[PDB]
Amino acid sequence: MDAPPLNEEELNQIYNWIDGIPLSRPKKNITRDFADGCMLAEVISHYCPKLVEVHNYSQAHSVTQKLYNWNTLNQRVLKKMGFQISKNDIDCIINAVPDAVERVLKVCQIKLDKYLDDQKKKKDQQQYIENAQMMQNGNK
Amino acid sequence: SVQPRTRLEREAMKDKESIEKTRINQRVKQLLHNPDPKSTLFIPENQRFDKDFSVFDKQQRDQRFATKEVALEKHRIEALERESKRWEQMENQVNKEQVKRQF
Amino acid sequence: MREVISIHVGQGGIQVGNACWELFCLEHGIQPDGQMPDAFNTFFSETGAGKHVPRAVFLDLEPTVIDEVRTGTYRQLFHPEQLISGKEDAANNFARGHYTIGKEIVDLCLDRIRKLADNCTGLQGFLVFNSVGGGTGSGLGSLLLERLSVDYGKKSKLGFTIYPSPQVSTAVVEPYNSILSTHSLLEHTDVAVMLDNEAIYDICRRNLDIERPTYTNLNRLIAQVISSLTASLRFDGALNVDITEFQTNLVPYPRIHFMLSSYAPIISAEKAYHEQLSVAEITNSAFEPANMMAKCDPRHGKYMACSMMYRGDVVPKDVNASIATIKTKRTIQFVDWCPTGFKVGINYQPPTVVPGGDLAKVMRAVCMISNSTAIAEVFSRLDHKFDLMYAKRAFVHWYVGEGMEEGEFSEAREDLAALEKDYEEVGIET
Amino acid sequence: MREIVHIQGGQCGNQIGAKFWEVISDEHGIDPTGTYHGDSDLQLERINVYYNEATGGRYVPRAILMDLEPGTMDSVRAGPFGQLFRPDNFVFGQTGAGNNWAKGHYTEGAELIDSVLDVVRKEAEGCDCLQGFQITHSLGGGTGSGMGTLLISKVREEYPDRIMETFSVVPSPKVSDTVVEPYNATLSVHQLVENADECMVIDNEALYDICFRTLKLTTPTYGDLNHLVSAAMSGVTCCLRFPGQLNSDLRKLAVNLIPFPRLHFFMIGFAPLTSRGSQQYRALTVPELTQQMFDAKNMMCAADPRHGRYLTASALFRGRMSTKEVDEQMLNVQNKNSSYFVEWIPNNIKSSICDIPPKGLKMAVTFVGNSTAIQEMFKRVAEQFTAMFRRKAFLHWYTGEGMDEMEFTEAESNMNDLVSEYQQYQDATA
């Protein structure tokens, strides 16, 4: 995902957004603290608890386990939100390359807001259909 | 343990030029079916038919373990020998000091 | 007055049958000649004076393995005319062993099955072994299961199938016949146990410390699992379990009966006795994801029900004290609609050791049969492998020309999609 | 059971067979007088695959030798192991073809072939269960490339369900010994694709390159090339004559290596091959075998296998070895070379293990891989054919015996279509 580098204002917005979320562990270095994919799973679970099984993502120092966590998150969660992270971007994140996680967090934020709006519209439409069917059965 | 003998044993050195002298002194192929007996590849024709990796591996595995066990006992003994000499030498030093004092 | 009949078809099936039949003969004291120098009745039958005959039948179209069996040390044990052999191999073609050459052999096998069944009076059920990634194995297993399901009806049949590994494979066409055989046994077998080779290779490497294993080492572990499963029928125990007491405890719904197994402890005599092998540590090792007998991660899914067998000098209170600890852990979570999910069995006979083998002699052991939601990954990856080649219709001409119709591939794909949807539908909380 | 008969034609095929049968007899311990003098029991269990039994206890090969001139068979009889062949199977004409394809396929080869077909029918009708036929012939000669290919069609018309093998030597442009090689090569390739179930191309240039570079012997002769070809030929059917962990007959290879019915042109190679002076340095291990097996210079064809992508591959290991190592090495050779393996068919390497190694060697491997790099040979053959045909050079010799230029045009068009549709799958993506 060749996303442009984030400006300082966009970085501050992402950090404030992430600090508004009650995560299981205090943040000290976002680039390192997200490198295992566990904190991104918690961030998504806060808004979409039925979408993410956080227990499938164990805290990880090894490259192999970080890569497993990220591939699992990318296939099971992010794909359902209508985006996927590239292998190269995953490799940048697990190595704590600067700006790599912040770009992914920005894309995740935008995709999460859109996903929540689409879930709300589906509920409102389903409730309208259920109410319309109840009014037809009352006449029968 | 670096070591040398007495002065008499070396006996070459009182202004020796022998070392200089020594420098002066110097002035349809069928090899597929016929691998050499020495080589690893050669399996005897008579034994060509044991067909079990299982039994063979178990005996081989047992042997591979055993060499390591004897090796461990030997290397540890060498470790013990440096330490024993040092312990002995410190004790020896005390005896020796004692010996000179008595002399 | 309780009996069971084991069916061995294909090269892998026969090679694991040999492995289990050294172990049973050793465990009941019967010499390889069949002569003893009342628990034998489950697997054997008395001939009136002397030898015992196994309640097993060996099937294969390719004669090499049967000929090897009929000349080894066990030539005197098996009845000469229950080792049914063909002439022409199916050659990894599923359509061959289901439509062309298996039909002419299946009648003799069914006659042998009838002749063995009329002798039994308390027949508990059938056991069947077959490596799935082969022509004759999968095809004949499918045909035999389909014939037995209508000849006998409600009798229970158990299948110890060996699915291909995620990435390691010996053939190139095994996804096709694996998918077709899964289609066939989905609606025809009561229990199916996962047995892929890669997980057992890792088990041997990590625990047994063997760097060059062969198939015999794998088959011995499978034989030990079978013996642990069937010990409760032929030995006295404080908490017995029968074969018929499974679909009431491990199978929530008729479609879902694929589960994966594990065994503990697995350790060599060189370092076994240095540690005490308490029941708590063995029951912890049995639940470790790395000790699954199939290469699947249980951390990726929920548990549905766990049936786990002990044998040796284990005391029930120690078992309960260890089930509580497992319920405590946060990394193992059960499905919402199942408050208790454990079925426990305790037997007194310790596992028997085979001379020259890998495993050592121990007084306690545990074998677990666990049904979990995480099994859908193997179906998904096999489906992905199948789709890649079915997109271009590769290797299909080898199947269409053996009597199979073109549309038969699609409906197996639809049934796998249905199974994957069902596994997702069950695992969601209410 | 499941045995095959041997049929050879032409001088090159006769010389190949004269060493193939010597190698087989030495493997089974049969003296040149037809008397068994072997050491192991397994040497006699499956001898019915290639040898028949006659009164007096001696064995006779079921080989059929045909040529349009009597010299080569009158010479092979005086060589070692020449007495094994039954005198009745020798059929020959009095005229010869003179490297003219038309004479060996229309005028002279048509009248003679009835007698050889009579003995072929006698041999096939009698045998217990037929597996198939294997054919050795050269595409650079007239009588061979004509009569052999017409015999292929005649055999296929009568036994449509059996399997057919052909080991074909194609004329390379580097070492050319006949000026009319392109004509009878192009005409033969047209008929060979329509009837042969399997085809294995062998080039004299690649054999000279191997002998000069790997064995490093000073003066290669036809005896060394024949010995290498014979070892490669024997390696394919080894597990059909000996027990093993995973038996795999010819039909199983046919299922797993041919994705589409018209793509059945393989190139092979044999390992290990070491010089006399370095046979003591090397240590025989599975990694050492597999690194030489996939080596580009080790292929029996001048085609460069890193100029294309493998559709599938096969390996037939010999000797007693662990299967886990074989599978992991096959996986490793496929992960490190993902660029040279087609991506829409996963797990495209087949492996097999036979517990009986060659006499004198502890481990051996035979490699059969279906690759897209074979297009280069047909490209150069067609290039020479169209360079020579545009001037109608040497055309009158062929047209004076009832043949016309239309059959040349159709052959060229079909060969070019084969070349195109063989590479069509090289650029195919999922």
Ligand SMILES: Nc1nc2c(ncn2[C@@H]2O[C@H](COP(=O)(O)OP(=O)(O)OP(=O)(O)O)[C@@H](O)[C@H]2O)c(=O)[nH]1
């Ligand atoms: N666990 C285990 N698996 C085996 C063994 N032998 C073969 N297999 C598996 O079986 C698969 C192929 O089927 P096979 O059993 O070898 O052959 P088959 O079932 O008789 O089918 P055919 O090829 O038609 O003869 C391979 O992919 C192997 O993984 C074995 O001894 N142990």
Ligand SMILES: Nc1nc2c(ncn2[C@@H]2O[C@H](COP(=O)(O)OP(=O)(O)O)[C@@H](O)[C@H]2O)c(=O)[nH]1
């Ligand atoms: N390997 C091998 N190849 C040979 C031998 N003799 C001839 N050839 C090849 O066969 C080709 C000629 O074929 P030819 O003898 O005319 O076949 P024929 O027309 O059927 O008799 C030459 O290009 C040679 O490379 C041999 O003894 N061994």
Ligand SMILES: [Mg+2]
């Ligand atoms: Mg088989």
